[PDB]
Each structure stands twice: as C-alpha cells, then as structure tokens.
Amino acid sequence: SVVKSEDYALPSYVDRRDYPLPDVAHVKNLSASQKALKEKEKASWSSLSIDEKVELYRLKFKESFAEMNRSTNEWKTVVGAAMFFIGFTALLLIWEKHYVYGPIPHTFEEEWVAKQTKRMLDMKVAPIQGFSAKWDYDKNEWKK
Amino acid sequence: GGGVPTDEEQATGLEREVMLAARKGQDPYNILAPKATSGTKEDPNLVPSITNKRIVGCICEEDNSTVIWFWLHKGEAQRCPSCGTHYKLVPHQ
Amino acid sequence: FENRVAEKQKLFQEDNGLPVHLKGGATDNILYRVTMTLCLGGTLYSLYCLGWASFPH
Amino acid sequence: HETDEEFDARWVTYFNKPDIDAWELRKGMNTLVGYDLVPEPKIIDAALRACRRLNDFASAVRILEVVKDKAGPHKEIYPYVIQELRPTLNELGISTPEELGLDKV
Amino acid sequence: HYEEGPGKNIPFSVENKWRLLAMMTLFFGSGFAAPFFIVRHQLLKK
Amino acid sequence: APDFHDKYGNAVLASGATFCVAVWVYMATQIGIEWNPSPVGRVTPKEWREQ
Amino acid sequence: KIKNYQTAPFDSRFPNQNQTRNCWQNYLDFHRCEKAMTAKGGDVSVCEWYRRVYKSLCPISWVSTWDDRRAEGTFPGKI
Amino acid sequence: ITAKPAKTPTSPKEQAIGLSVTFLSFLLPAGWVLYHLDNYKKS
Amino acid sequence: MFINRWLFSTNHKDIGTLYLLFGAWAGMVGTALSLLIRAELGQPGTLLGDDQIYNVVVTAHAFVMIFFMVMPIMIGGFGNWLVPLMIGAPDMAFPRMNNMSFWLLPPSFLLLLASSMVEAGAGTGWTVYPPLAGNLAHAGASVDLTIFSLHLAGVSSILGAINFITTIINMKPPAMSQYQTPLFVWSVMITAVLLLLSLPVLAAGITMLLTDRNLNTTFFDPAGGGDPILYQHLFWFFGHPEVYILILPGFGMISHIVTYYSGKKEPFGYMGMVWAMMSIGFLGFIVWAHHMFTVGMDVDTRAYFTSATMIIAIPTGVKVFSWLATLHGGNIKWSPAMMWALGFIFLFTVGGLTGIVLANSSLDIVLHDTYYVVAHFHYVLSMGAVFAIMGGFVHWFPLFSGYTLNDTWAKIHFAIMFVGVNMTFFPQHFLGLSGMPRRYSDYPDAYTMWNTISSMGSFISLTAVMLMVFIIWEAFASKREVLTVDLTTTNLEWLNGCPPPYHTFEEPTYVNLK
Amino acid sequence: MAYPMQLGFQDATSPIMEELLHFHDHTLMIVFLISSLVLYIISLMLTTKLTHTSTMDAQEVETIWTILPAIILILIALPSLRILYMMDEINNPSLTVKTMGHQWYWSYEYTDYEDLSFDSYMIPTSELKPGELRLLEVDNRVVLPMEMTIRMLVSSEDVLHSWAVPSLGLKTDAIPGRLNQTTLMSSRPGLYYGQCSEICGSNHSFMPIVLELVPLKYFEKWSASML
Amino acid sequence: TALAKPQMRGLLARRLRFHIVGAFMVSLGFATFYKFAVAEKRKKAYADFYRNYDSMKDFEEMRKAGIFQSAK
Amino acid sequence: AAKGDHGGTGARTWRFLTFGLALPSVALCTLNSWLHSGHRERPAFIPYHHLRIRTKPFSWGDGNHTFFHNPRVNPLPTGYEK
Amino acid sequence: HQTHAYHMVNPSPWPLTGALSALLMTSGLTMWFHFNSMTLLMIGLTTNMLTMYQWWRDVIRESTFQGHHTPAVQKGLRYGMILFIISEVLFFTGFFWAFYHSSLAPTPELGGCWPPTGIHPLNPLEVPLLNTSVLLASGVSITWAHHSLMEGDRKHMLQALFITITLGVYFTLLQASEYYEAPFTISDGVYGSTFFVATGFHGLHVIIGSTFLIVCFFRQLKFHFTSNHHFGFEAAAWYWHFVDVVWLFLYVSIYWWGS
Ligand SMILES: CCCCCCCCCCCCCCCCCC(=O)OCC(COC(=O)CCCCCCCCCCCCCCCCC)OC(=O)CCCCCCCCCCCCCCCCC
Ligand code: HEA
Ligand SMILES: CCCCC/C=C\C/C=C/C/C=C\C/C=C\CCCC(=O)O[C@H](COC(=O)CCCCCCCCCCCCCCCCC)COP(=O)(O)OCCN
Ligand SMILES: CCCCCC/C=C/CCCCCCCCCC(=O)O[C@H](COC(=O)CCCCCCCCCCCCCCC)COP(=O)(O)OC[C@@H](O)CO
Ligand SMILES: CCCCCCCCCCO[C@@H]1O[C@H](CO)[C@@H](O[C@H]2O[C@H](CO)[C@@H](O)[C@H](O)[C@H]2O)[C@H](O)[C@H]1O
Ligand SMILES: Cc1csc(-c2sc3ccccc3c2O)n1
C-alpha cells in the first residue's frame, strides 16, 4: 500500500496493460491469515475458494485490467469548462468594445457602402470570379 | 637546461590522485569504460560503488541506441530488465 | 625567482570552508567588495540615467 | 525471419523450462505482450503451468486478463482462447477473471 | 548545505499558498502590465 | 466512489455550452460590432458620381 | 538616325532587375561623348542616343545630383 | 504517474479565490490603461 | 545562503530554474505586446497612435518572444535541467560561465525596455533594416539600445552554446557514444552549433549598424558607397538559422514526449531522427535569401534559393512520419503533455507547408510582406515552439518541482489555447492572399472581418495564459508530491527522484563496453 | 482591389498573375492533401486498443518517406521555376516609368520624351468622395496605357519602401541608391490598387498605389496635360 | 458449440495497411474533386471571360461611369 | 622553401627558425620600411561627397575631427586645417 | 565524495559582476554616444577588468594550486577554446563579407571603381608587409616557446615568449603609427569603414592576445606550468595563431587585393 518518497530508487509497482506482471507484489506484508493463504496456494488451486482466489489476486495486484482501463466522465468537465472560459472571453470583448473602442470610420455607413459597392461594380472589381463576376450587368442585380 | 617542474613534482589535488592511480592501473574516478564479463549469474558484471546503490546503464546489444537504466543495489545480483545480463554491486571504501 | 607553488597549494587547500574567490585572505574580501559596490552602484546609476533619458528636456 | 510455428515453439519452450523462476516468468509475459499478436493458446497453456510450478495463482489470472486486452476490439478472440484452455483451467483450478468478478469496472 | 526536496529547490517560498498567490500575482502581473504602461508613457510624451 | 466528473460532469458541460453560446451570440449581434460582410446579395448599389 | 525612339531597349550588358549601372553607364557615355564633341568642334547631336537612354532610365534626382557635382568638381566618375 | 494526496488541499472555494485573483491581476492594470487611452491621446 | 545559491549559482538545475522563471516572465511581456497589436487591429481605424508606437510594439513583441521567452526556456531552461541528467553528468562543463549566460539576460531585457522608454522607441521591425533604423530616420538612443540588447543576448547564447557543445561531447559516460544519447541531447547540441556559427555574423552586422549610426561609417549608406541590402544578407544569414534554433529543441522534446506517452522504450528511427536534425541544421545555412526575393536579385539566385529552401521538407518529413510511427502501436496515455505534442505535429506541419509555398520566389512576390508570412511563422512558432514548450513544461514539471499538476485543469488549458491560436492566425492566410501588408496599424475596409475574428482569437489565448498561471499556483498550493514514474529505464532524467538532489551523479553511472 | 470576406488572391489582371493563380491552385492542393493525410494518420494511430511496443525496423519505410516527398517537391519546383524565368524573359517595353518612394508618398517620372513628374498622396479619410475607398485612393493616379508592356523602375530617396500591386502580381522593393526593374502588362482597363510593402515609419500604412489603365490615346493626352 | 479460431496475429499491421490504402483511395478522390471544383473551374472562368472580351467596350463602360481621372 | 632540416621538430629547430629566418625577415622588412618612409606630397583637396562623411557629430572634441585625425594629411569636410 | 573526474565549482560572484559590467559598458556607450558623458562607460570598463582578473585568478587557484584540472577537465577546456575561436572566425567573416560586397560591386557614389575616387591606399609593400613579417615571426617564436616548455627548458621558454610578446607590441605600435599617418579616415566612405573596423577589431584581438601571452609569461616566471600541463599557454598559442591567420586574410584582401 503505502509508497514513500525515499523509495524512488527501489523497484516499484505499476498497473499497466502493456506491463501485466510488475516488478513487485502490490502487498508485501502478510497477516497471519494471509500467510496461511499463501501456504494453501502451494496446494491444488481447486481447493481454494472464490474469496481466497480473489484475495490472492488482490495481494499481488492493485487494480484489475477492467478497473485500470475504465473510462471516465472527465471529458464533460474538460469540454464544459473550456466553453465557460471561452464564454468568459466574450465578456472581455464586450468590455473592450464598450470602454476602449471608439466609432469606426464613416466609410462603413450604409449609404457609403451602397455607393462604394456601385463604384466597385463600375470599375469591374474582380470581374472574372471574385466580385463583379457575381453581378448581372444586364438585369442590374446580383446573380442568383 | 631545466627549471620546469614536472607533474610528478607539482601536480596536486584530484589531478595527482588520477595520475598516481593510473600509474597503478586503477581507475577510482571512472575515466575508463569497464569491460563486460559474460554477464551470467555465475559470472556477473562487478559494479564498484562507494555507496550501497549505483545506476547501471545497459547497452543490451552492440550499436543499440537505447540505453536501459536501473539502480543496482547491494545484495544478490540483479538483471537488466531488457536483456537479463547480470550485475552485482561491490561496495568499498 | 624560486618555485613557491607548494606554498600556494597549501594555502588554497586549507580546510577552512572558504570559497576559492576568498581563500587568498583579507585582500580578496576587499577586492570583492570594491567590485560588487561599483557594479551595484553603477547599476543604480544606470537606472537613474534611464529615468532621466525617458523624458524630454 | 522465423515462421509463426517457430515463434510459438520458442515461447512454448521458454515457459516449459521446469525450473523457470519468477523473474523469467515476468520477463516472458512482459516481452510477449509487446508483439502484434494475441498469444496462441499453447503458449498461454505453458505460461499458466509455469505459474503453477511457481505457486503463483494471481499471475495466472493476470495472464488471462492480458490475453483479452491484447485482442483489442476483436471480442471473439478471448472466448476462443478460454475455450481451448478449459481443460488446463480445470486441471489446475484456475478461475477466469470473469468467474472471479475481476472483469467489473 | 542547502535545503532539498519539493518546495525547497526554488528561489521563492511555497510555505503559505496565499502569500505565494500574492507573489505570483506581482511576478506575472508586473510583466503583463509593463507594456501597457509603456504605451501610456509614450502617449503622454506627445 | 463517484468522483468530481461523475457528480458534476453533466452540469459543467451543459452550463458551459449554454453560457458560451449565449454570450458570443450577444457579443456578435447586440453591441454594434461591424463585421463588414460581403455586399454580394445583400447591398443595393447606389449612385455615387456627382457633377 | 534610327529614330521613333520609344524607350530604352533591352541591353544585354544589364539583363537583371538591378538597373543602377545601366543608368550610370549611359550618363557617363553621354557626357564623355559630349566632352569629346565639344573640345574638337564637332556636334553634340551624335551623343543623342546616350542622352535619350539615361533620361529614360535615370531618376531625376540622380541626374540633378550628378549634374551639380560635375559643376562643383566633385563628380567621382571619369569623364 | 502516481502521487500522494495533497498535503495542503485547495478546496473549490480556494481555487475560486486563486483563479479570480490571478485573472484580476492581468485584467485590472491593462483595463485601467485602455480605459484611459483617450485621456492619454488627447492631452 | 540565498545570495550564494541563486545569485552565485554553479548548479545546472538552479540555473535552469532561473531560465524558466525568466522566460515565463518574458512570456507575459510578449503576450501583452501581442494583445496591444491585435487591439489596434481589432476594428478599422486607429486606437493607440500612428505606425511608430504601433511598430515599436510589434518590434518588441518579436524580440521578447524570440530572445527572452523561447530561447531561454528551451535552451537555458530545459537544456540546463535535462541535458546533464540525460547523460549522467554531474553538471555542465563550465558551471560558472553557465551562470553568466543567464545573468546577461536581465540586463539585455532592461536594455530593450530602455529603448522603448527613451525618445519614440525603435519602430523598425525585429529585422532592424536600415536606413529606417539609421541615425536620420531613427535619431536618438532607441535603436542603439536595441543593438546593445542584442549584443548581450548574443554573448549569452554564444557562451551557452560553447557550454552545451563541450558538455555533450566531453561529459558522457566513457562507454556511451554519441549515437547512444537521447534525441533531446542531440537537438540541443545541433542548436548550439547553429548558435555558435550564426550569432557572430549577426553581431558583426549590428555592430556595423552601430558604427553607421555613431561613428560615420557607411556600410549600409549608399552616399558612402554602402548598400542597405548588405545588412539584409548579414541579418538573414543569422536569421534563418535562428528560426531553426527556435524549433530544434522543440523537435527534441516532442520526440521524448511522443515516445513516453506512447508507452514506447525508444523513438522510431533513432538514426533517421539524428540525420534529419543534422540535415535541417546544415540546410538552414544556405537558404537565407528567401527572405529577400523582392529586393532585386538575379533570376538564377532566386532559382537556387527556391530549390534549396524546399529540400528542407525531406528531412523534416522524416521526423513527422517518425513521430507518427512512434504513436503506431503504442499504449496511448492521453495526458495533457501528449495533447500538446499531438497539436504540435499537426499545426507545425501546416505552418511548414505554407513555408514551402513561400519558398517559391514567383509566388512569394505577391505573398512577401503580407500576413500570409505572419500566418506561416505563427503556425510554426506560436503553434510549434510554444506547444513544444507547453508539452515539455507539463511533462517535466513534476521532475523539476516534485509536485503534480491538475491534469483536468491542464487539459482545459490546452483546449482553450488550441481554439484561441487557430482562431487568431488561420484567417490571416486569407488576409495575406488578398494582399494585406505586414506591419500595418490600419487596413482598407475590405479586410475588416478577418482582422476582427483574429483579434477575438487573441483574447481567447489571453484567457489560456491567465489560466496557466492559476494552474501553476494550484500545483504549488496543493503540494501533491510525486511517488512513482513510469519508464524510468529509458528516461534517465527521472531516475534520481522528484526533484533530484542538488548534486546528482556524484558517483557516475556504470556502463560497460562489452 | 480586395473585397470583403475575400479568401484567395485578387482576380488576375496580367497573364503572369494568371500563371501564379494556377500554380497556387496546384500547390494548395498538395498542401491540403499532406496536412489532411497527417491529420488522418494521427487519428488512425490514436483510435485502436491494439498495441505493438517492441522495436520497429525503420529502413524499408524511410525510402517511402524520402522518395515520395522528393517527387512532390519536384512536381512543385517544375512549374514554379517555369514561371520564374517566364517573369524574367526578355520583353520589349514601349514605355519606361520610374517611381520614387518617400516618407510618406510615391512620386512618378515619365521621362521618355517630356519631363513629366508628380507626387501621389493618399486621400485623407475626411476628404474621400462618396464611394471612394478608405486608405486606398490617391490624389494623382498612375495613368498607364493598357495592353502594353511597361518597364517600371523603382527606387527611394529616403528609407526602404516597396512598390506593390497585387492584381498584377507586382512587388518591387524601393531602395535608395538602387534602381530595381519590373515589367507591367495589364490585360484590361480600370483601377488597380496597391500599398507600400516595406515598413518605412509613421505613415507606412498610408502611402498607397493606384494604377489607371486606359487606351494609348487617352494616356498620351493625359501625359501632355500633366507637363 | 465450439467457437471457430479467429485470426490472432498481425491485427494491428492489417488494420494499418487497410486504412493506408483507404487514405490513398480517398486522396485520389479528392485530387479529382479539386481539379474539377477549383483548378479546372479557374481555367475555364478565365478562358470564358477573355474568349470574346472587348477591352475598348470595357473601357467605354468605365469611362461613361465616370471612374477615370484621364478619361471623362 | 628549400630547408630540409627534418626529423624531430624540437625547441632547437624552432629557435633555429626564429633567429635564422623569422627575425632576419623582420630586420629586412624594417630596413625596407625605414627607406620608403618620409612624408609624401598630400593631394589637392576635393570635397567629394562620398568622403569625410558626417551624419552625426563624433562624441569627442568638436564633433568634426576623426579619432586619429592627422592635420597634415586628413582634411575636414571644408578642407585641410591650417 | 565524488567518484568522477569533473570540477564542481564553488559558488561565485563573478558571473553576476561580469553581466553587470556588460550592462554598464553598453549603457555607458549609449550615454557617451547620445548624452555626452563617459561616467557609466568608465565604471563598466573598470568592473569588467576586475571581473576578468578575479575570474581567471580563481581558475589559476583551482588548477595550479588546488589540482582540479584532471585530464577530463583539460579536455573540456580544449573544446571550449576551440569553439570560442570558431565563433571569433565567424565574427570576422561578417566584416570580410562587408568588404568584398562593397569592393566587388563599387557603387556610382564611389566613381564605380575600387579603390574609390579620392582614396589613396597605403603601399602594401611598406609597413603592412613589415606587420606581416612581424606576426609570422611571432608564430615561429611562440612555437619555439612551446617546445622549450615541453622539453623542460625554463630559460628558453621565457626568452621565446618574451620575443613573441615584443613582436606583438611591435605590431601594435606600427599599426597605431599607420592609423595616425593614413590619409584616409573611418569616415571616408565604405573604404575607410571596412578598413578601420576590420583592422581595428583585429588590432583589439592583437592586444587581447598579447595580454594573454603576458599572463602566461608571469605565470611561467612563477613556475605555474609543468612540462606536460600548461593549457593556459596552449590556449594563448591557439589564439595567437588565430590572430596571425586573420591578419594574413586582412593583408591579402584589404591591403593587397583591395588596393
Ligand atoms: C485545419 C486548418 C489549420 C488549423 C485551423 C483550425 C481552426 C478551424 C479552421 C479550419 C477549418 C477549415 C480548413 C480548410 C479551410 C479551407 C478554406 C478554403 O476554401 O480555402 C480557399 C483558399 C482560396 O481559394 C479560393 O479562392 C476559392 C474561393 C471559394 C470561395 C467560396 C465562398 C464560400 C465561403 C466559405 C467561407 C469559409 C469561411 C472560413 C472561416 C474560418 C474562420 C476560422 O484559401 C486558402 O488558400 C487558405 C490557405 C490555407 C493554408 C493552410 C492550409 C491548411 C490545411 C489544413 C486542412 C486539413 C485538415 C482539415 C480538417 C481540420 C480539422 C481541425
Ligand atoms: C520555428 C520557426 C520557423 C520554421 C520552422 C520555419 C520553417 C520554414 N520556413 Fe519560415 N519563417 C519564420 C519562422 C520559421 N519558418 C519566420 C519567423 C519568418 C519571417 C521572418 C520575418 O520576416 O520577420 C519566416 C519566413 C519564411 C519565408 C519568407 C516569407 C517572406 O518573408 O516573404 C519563407 C520562404 O521561403 C519561409 C520558408 C520556410 C520553410 C520552407 C520552412 C521549412 O523548414 C518547413 C518544413 C516543414 C514541412 C514542409 C512540413 C513537414 C514535412 C512533411 C509533412 C513532408 C511532406 C511535405 C512536402 C512533400 C512538402 N519562411
Ligand atoms: C591598434 C589600434 C586599435 C584601436 C584602438 C582604438 C580604440 C579602441 C577601441 C576598440 C574598438 C574596436 C572596434 C571599434 C570599431 C571601429 C574602430 C576602428 C579602429 C580605429 O580606431 O580606427 C580609427 C577610428 O577611431 C574611432 O573613432 C574609434 C572610437 C571609439 C569607438 C568605440 C566603439 C566601440 C563599439 C563596440 C561595439 C561592440 C563590439 C562587438 C561586440 C560583439 C559581441 C558579440 C581611425 O581613425 P581616424 O581618426 O578615422 O583617422 C585615420 C587616419 N589618420
Ligand atoms: C589591455 C586591453 C584589455 C582589453 C580586455 C581584454 C583583456 C584581456 C584578456 C586576455 C585573456 C586572458 C586570459 C587569462 C587566463 C588565465 C587563467 C588560465 O589560463 O588558467 C588555466 C586554464 O585557462 C583557461 O581557462 C583558458 C581560458 C581562456 C579564456 C580567454 C580567451 C580570450 C578571451 C578574450 C575576450 C574576447 C573579446 C572578444 C571581443 C570581440 C589553468 O590551466 P593551465 O594553465 O594548463 O595550468 C594549470 C597547471 O598549473 C597545473 O599544473
Ligand atoms: C488586453 C488585456 C485587457 C483586456 C480586457 C480588460 C478587462 C477590463 C477589466 C476591468 O478593468 C477595469 O475596468 C474599469 C471599468 O469597468 C475601470 O474603471 C474605470 O471606469 C469605471 C467605471 O466608469 C470608473 O468607476 C473608474 O473610476 C475608472 O477608472 C478600471 O480602471 C479598470 O481597471
Ligand atoms: C509601447 C511599447 C512599444 S515596445 C514597448 C515595450 S514594453 C517592454 C517591456 C519589456 C521589454 C521591452 C518592452 C518594450 O519594447 N512598449
């Protein structure tokens, strides 16, 4: 059980599905009954009960493969907390637009943009694909 | 003419220790690579140490780029976890 | 000149716990304190000069 | 390199050494599960009998666990291996992880 | 000799998590704040 | 025993997604940010030239 | 002589993007020819091709600076 | 990796304090400067 | 005791810790400068001032991030911590000179600060091209303080390069050949060789700019027979080796991280990884003029540098595919460090591929000095070097400190950062292709949308940075002490515990030759 | 010019810019293909419980990892260099125009016949006429004859600048003491915009370029009227 | 009753080869889609635009719209 | 070169080279130099604009004299000083 | 305690004082160039000398007096010195690059020729040739010094090393005289720029190398060197040969080909 800091130079226990038989037993110190269980293990294992067999496993190993490989719900915490802080970021952007940014130039007014759009169509801005190509000069409208 | 001291006359400190030990064919400060034995349990590699544990790096096969590192402790010979060659610590000093 | 290296080896291998830059004796401490004072005093003066130079005159 | 039959024969021989010790058992299993294969039942059989000679019931159950693990999403491999091992499991008194409840999360 | 182990191999104290918070606040905060106040400094010159 | 994610996972995911969508939709549409989208299919061109 | 001059034609001596020496060479060539034609009483009009090319190629401020320095006696090229 | 339990556990409330204090140490000084930008420009 | 340990250090671990603290503090400075950049661009118009203040911010943003954040953290920080441990050495070859390499950086940082405080700052770009950086267009002390800052940082790295090369060549176990050293050790040595060869050329270049500004030389002044293009050659002869200096230690940490969290004992194709890093370092010295495709060079020179630049993709591709081959068949542990490394592999690949686009001088005519370039290097620097730094930090933090991070918080941090960085810089491809120039404080109205999205992304990354500081606090606040670490048999740096003792390998490792 | 929400290059106005568009399409497909393959393989490596952790032999597979990229690089270099030298090909221009960079404006010189020169400043935002483009319009445009090969000569009289027109695939650095040459051929009339492309001080963003492409006859009359 | 012996060797290598071939197939499929939706589309758009393009007529429309400084 | 003188390259051989070749060469160059010495006639001053560069005053003297200014041979931007 | 051969250095203040001296020298130069004062600069230079003296003093204490320079430590110092010289080669390479850039493509402002109009170069066969024979001769004498030291000859070591130092001083005095006598200055365009900056940095390295040799001279007087252990001399000899080769390149490039 209890692993210590000054133990780092000694062989240790791990639960790894690619390292099924670790270097040491999970439990090194045996009680009186655990000592007798290990003695019984030297005889036919058919004479061992289910509980005794489970107990032998839990002395050698900490977690089973099913336990060590189990899935968790951590992704809900990770994805949800990430969306909170991304949401909190929008609060910073709202504060910046309100207290830091002044008005944008007058060229973004609706009437400027409408006249600017015609002049761009008058000079045939991007007439092959990008812009004027999407205006119908015969019907005087945006192509459908 | 002379007048220039030699290392035998004037070398001191750790330099002198390394010089005198090399003249006896000894390597207390680990300048040389030890030559391996066959590494069996009967003929293990003998690892000197001034303490009761030392880190061993095992190049399991010639030209392996991966080195296998483990603590070798005082007591019964231990085996490299990759190739199984035996190492036994010999504390001294 | 005579070879007095043995005397210097004995002085600087003396088991007194002093670091090498102070093991020569009291003169080492004086030269250290002169050096560190000029460095730290000069550094503070450079910060003053930055403060002065950071505004128009 | 070597054929499948020669690979299996090397590993059967490895685990069949009468005086195999605990280190060699762990070394064999930990090395074997590094390969891109689920070990043949005859290899597991030899490994389980090595556990018997070493009086190590728990490692025998663990070996059965890693057979299932090495199969990945191919659920049909582990029931087949257990099927082929049932005579050995009965002879030696080895309960499966399922029979012991060790397949529960 | 010097102190060894977790929390002892660093030039700052972690003995008290709240004093540490104040110090990490001053440390990283001063670095982040510095360019804004240098922006301010340059704007206030002309 | 159930850990933090078993107890609070579903709530953290649901609240976080709802808070994030709501505040970014608000910021995008309600505070006067000019995205300057394409005029194609959106703007009616207006006479610009004068005498 | 071979007129209808549009602009300075391609010159194999100066085939790259850096055209500094092209302008420099023709400016030298014109004023070297002009000096030869002035001293011997001939006609500067034979230097005309060099004049058109350097006027086409050289920035106005380059010609004006070079002209000022020829008059000051500080022009570093050989004419 | 395996580790001991926290020698000085940091409760959810304590983490809320540390997170809030950390964010405020970044946001308040810069916010102050950016809020007063016009005071700096037209001056 | 405190002054002796932290001001007079001759210990590779403590000095590494000093570098990490310095680089983290500088990372705050560089981050704030980056927000000031994107705040100016976050909506059309002006916010701060005109281009001088804006491009003093831009210039310092590059200098702080490159010379004071990435290089001290990767080379001075991880290098000093890991390299001696990974070869079983008791310390660096020159442990006292090692300390001066660090302590040259705070004064170097102070000099950069001074340049922005005096006069109107150095608004030159981190390339410091003359004549804009000359004494007529930038009269005053600002540019000279920038030059001196680079001088001190240059000396620091040059001496550090001498230290690393000597340590890696001379202080290995006698049985260990160079082909038995971990890939990170290889990446640091190669980086150190590039530093040794490139920084002296930069020092010469900027010294000639110093004398042009103050001693009436005319290296770069046509009036005296000089050439501004000469400076560009001298800078970029250092300039490209520098960007590979920035990424190579990242390459080495990625190799270790991908190998570790794939459950592998070794990376795929060790010798191929060595060959590729050595080929990348060699090729990085003969391609510099791809930063000058629009200065007026001959077509044959532009044909060579186009071809020589693109060859780098072959050794780099070997590394990318070897990392993928290391993942292949692994028992994948989805740690936060692994996520950073997986984000590195993809995002570095994207930025590398856009570099290959820029390598074509014909296409570079339209893309040079546009935000397509900014998109290229932020994908390799801000999504390569930083992700490698973040992966290395969260992987080795338990080794350096002895405490564990909160893995859930760290995964949350990665997720916020991944969204913020991609929202910031991916739309900058569109701005570049459509013709938005670099180093602009304002843009034509058509460029509004992508600049707006990009600046919003920068705020998301700010939230990640603030969360990172909290996560580090939480780890030190809770004090979860490390117990066991996996795979110590192929990760020597962990084998002395967490943290390792002040003195490690006082008795060297035992490695026989057979 | 660029339009809102633009993703790619401005529409080509010159045959060379057309060539760059098709080369970019060719290269961008390869960029998409390799990054997608890398992303897919990453997900492939990460989505199986099957394991293989013993030593892997690398020799055979690295031939593939080296020959295939080498072929791809050649498939990029071949059209890239063809366009490179096609840009450099000898052409016979009928007009030479010089542009000088300044802080912070462009001056232009037409000195083939007359000494025509003028300055070109950005129209301030408060003085824009309805429908004109912020930061892009100039007071005096660069009037040029359409469908003719023009030699542009670029230099500067102070710091570095760069004379760029994306529509025509043009960008030539403006360097004091140096005369850089590029070739200009517009297939169409109209207005074509660019901006200074080398950091040059306080008004780097505010010294744009506007080309006005018209028939020869209108250019000749405009030139005479500008003396 | 008894279960049949499944394949037990090389499952990882077989999964890899299958999907590498899969990725190759999809790559060819994308290169065809890209040639059709991007590359050929761009060639045809420019080819169609210039086939009967009249630059003087284009200029006259621009002149009549009043965009030029040099042509009223 | 035509000195055999090979075998062990020792202190004696290198002293031989020092006194037999190296220092004699220095004496000959010293002789040669102290024969072509003596001042030559300084050339006419021409205020060339690529020479006598002044973009910032020097940080010593009056800001207009170079560091090792020689009045005899180094003219100022305005010419030789008297 | 240690069973390796490497040197664990005592904690030391000289890294900090050296770093602060660089701050003072660089801020001093800025103070001198822009604010008409030499105070910071003279403090930085003073602390720089003090740092270098005590730093290298301690290295002598650690090696000659304390014996920490084992063969492995010496091998490391060999790599360090070789790598440092390499970095110095690349530093000068940038100046040779600048010289050849300007001289192979002379601009119109020069007259389109090299040497530029109005530049009257020094005669390469007079003092520049004398300087060449001086440094070449000092390479011979320092090689005699080395072999004398290895063969245990104290007197001839000091004689050869003194001759080497005298030649280095001779070169410096000749160059100082050439500088004063030159009819061109550092402000005479790119010719004067490349000439004095390249030869000036070399002259500084000659003074540095002469100082290093003088240190070795007095250490030899005090019997510091053994016939087998004397890296301080070897490093100074490598640095001196580097100084010699740089001059040979300067002579061929700037004095001879560039005339
Ligand atoms: C993946 C990219 C790098 C990482 C970034 C991750 C963040 C997510 C973004 C990422 C999500 C989208 C990823 C592909 C976007 C392609 C957009 C495009 O149509 O590009 C077109 C071209 C220009 O071509 C044209 O002229 C065609 C004009 C067609 C116009 C039609 C109008 C329709 C409107 C469409 C609006 C799109 C708005 C997009 C707005 C996007 C705002 C963020 O632009 C360019 O060249 C841009 C230069 C890109 C250079 C780097 C390539 C990296 C490829 C990695 C992908 C593999 C993994 C995928 C799977 C990815 C899974 C992660
Ligand atoms: C970490 C830093 C870093 C890295 C690694 C790179 C990597 C590369 N860079 Fe980048 N670059 C910069 C930092 C970096 N760059 C910076 C800072 C600038 C601008 C400086 C300034 O002006 O301020 C810049 C600018 C820059 C330009 C100039 C653009 C301009 O200014 O006009 C060019 C052009 O050649 C370029 C090219 C490359 C290339 C070819 C690579 C290659 O090394 C990338 C190779 C990687 C890959 C190609 C992906 C992996 C390979 C495969 C998956 C195999 C399959 C691929 C193929 C078959 C192609 N870079
Ligand atoms: C044998 C003589 C050796 C020279 C001794 C003279 C002073 C010592 C200074 C050493 C500086 C070394 C490099 C300096 C660069 C240029 C100096 C050129 C050498 C020189 O001294 O040349 C003189 C210039 O003097 C001048 O102004 C120089 C005035 C002082 C300028 C100091 C500038 C220092 C700049 C240091 C920059 C950093 C250095 C590199 C650090 C790199 C770190 C990686 C020429 O004199 P003149 O009056 O033009 O007339 C000549 C005809 N009578
Ligand atoms: C007058 C104008 C002054 C201007 C400022 C310049 C000042 C001059 C500095 C000149 C160089 C002085 C170097 C003195 C070094 C003395 C210490 C020393 O040399 O110590 C030796 C090792 O040195 C070692 O690190 C070798 C270390 C060599 C390092 C120095 C190399 C030169 C660096 C100079 C600075 C570069 C500047 C570049 C500027 C562009 C000790 O080993 P040994 O000698 O084998 O013997 C020990 C035996 O006794 C045992 O039996
Ligand atoms: C780029 C990194 C930063 C971007 C995001 C910044 C987020 C801002 C966080 C809050 O900052 C505070 O904002 C207050 C306003 O909400 C300011 O008070 C100012 O405004 C108050 C409200 O009008 C007044 O009461 C105060 O006196 C006045 O100082 C205050 O100075 C500032 O610290
Ligand atoms: C407004 C502005 C432009 S640059 C600048 C700053 S802040 C700063 C902080 C530390 C080091 C350098 C700088 C630097 O150059 N602020």
Residue numbers in the entry:
A (entry chain D): 4 to 147
B (entry chain F): 3 to 95
C (entry chain J): 1 to 57
D (entry chain E): 5 to 109
E (entry chain L): 2 to 47
F (entry chain K): 6 to 56
G (entry chain H): 7 to 85
H (entry chain M): 1 to 43
Study authors write:
HCOs are terminal respiratory enzymes present in all three domains of life: bacteria, archaea, and eukaryotes. HCOs receive electrons from the respiratory chain and reduce molecular oxygen to water. This exergonic reaction is coupled with proton pumping across the membrane, which contributes to maintaining the proton motive force that is further used for ATP production. HCOs are multi-subunit complexes, and their constitution varies among species; however, subunit I is a catalytic subunit common in all HCOs.
